[PDB]
Design a protein around this ligand. Structure first.
Ligand SMILES: COc1cc(-c2cnc(N)c(-c3ccc(C(N)=O)cc3)c2)ccc1O
Length: 284
């Protein structure tokens, strides 16, 4: 059974994932999502400490937290469910929709990056859709694995006299960890546009570690011929092996594919519409 303190504010309903439960807030009769996590502590102390501090349309907000036998985390409820469900089993979203979704993905991740945060676990199932409309807001979720951006920094201005070699060498590449969420975005954009994974083991004898390190991804021109060159061009620039050359969230946001005033207009429209709920009258 659930804590008295939890049951006291919420009315636990059905299951949504596995675990995430649906619940109603007593005060308001509004639907919320409650994530349960059994005992560990580190990932949560931080996911909360992060979520609490974050503030963006395309990042999931935390509504409440319960430290008990297990951990209960109360979040905004995304009604469209996971993005994974939209692409699983070679389903595929129309390009215009991918641009819409990916644009928000870029905004969200750029946001984290501006704030010294690295998600590190971006997958189709950590992206949630605000409704069942395929014209909806998406939100990034699952900050369990996030890093937060100085060891080297200090080590640097000192006596390199005893400093091991490997550490100085580590400098050239230091400070580029975020590049890994851009990889992941790349992988995601691929699956979305095509229907299929860039590096799977379906019909191929080359290892998976080797497809990825090489950069050589299963490219099936039959499916891709349906997809624009502008789109695919971007996928290519995110799936760069060298992280220093890889596209950043910003370079991606400046890419031709994303200079599309309609998709941006639709996102606007979509934005304000969510905000009508909270719209405070303001000074004129
Ligand atoms: C179609 O209905 C479904 C909804 C959900 C669902 C709805 N809202 C959410 N906030 C979440 C959710 C997903 C991931 C996490 C995380 N990993 O921390 C937290 C909350 C899920 C899921 C399936 C559905 O069929």
């Amino acid at each position: 059974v659930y804590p008295k303190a939890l049951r006291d504010e919420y009315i636990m309903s059905k299951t949504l994932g596995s675990e995430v439960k649906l619940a109603f807030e007593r005060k308001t009769c509004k639907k919320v999502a409650i994530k349960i996590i059994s005992k560990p502590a580190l990932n949560v102390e931080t996911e909360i400490e992060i979520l609490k501090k974050l503030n963006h349309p395309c990042i999931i907000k935390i509504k409440n937290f319960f430290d008990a036998e297990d951990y209960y985390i109360v979040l905004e409820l995304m009604e469209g469910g996971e993005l994974f469900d939209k692409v699983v089993g070679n389903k595929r979203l129309k390009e215009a929709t991918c641009k819409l979704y990916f644009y928000q993905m870029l905004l969200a991740v750029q946001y984290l990056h501006e704030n010294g945060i690295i998600h590190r676990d971006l997958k189709p199932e950590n992206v949630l859709l605000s409704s069942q409309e395929e014209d909806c807001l998406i939100k990034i979720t699952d900050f369990g694995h996030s890093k937060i951006l100085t060891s080297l920094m200090r080590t640097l201005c000192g006596t390199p006299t005893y400093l091991a070699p490997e550490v100085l060498v580590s400098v050239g590449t230091a400070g580029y960890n975020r590049a890994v969420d851009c990889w992941s975005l790349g992988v995601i954009l691929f699956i979305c546009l095509s229907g299929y994974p860039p590096f799977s083991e379906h019909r191929t004898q080359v290892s998976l570690k080797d497809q990825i390190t090489s950069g050589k991804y299963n490219f099936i021109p039959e499916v891709w011929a349906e997809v624009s060159e502008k789109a695919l061009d971007l996928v290519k620039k995110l799936l760069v092996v060298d992280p220093k050359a890889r596209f950043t969230t910003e370079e991606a946001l400046r890419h031709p594919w994303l200079q599309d005033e309609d998709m941006k207009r639709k996102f606007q429209d979509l934005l304000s519409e969510e905000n009508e709920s909270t719209a405070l009258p303001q000074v004129l």
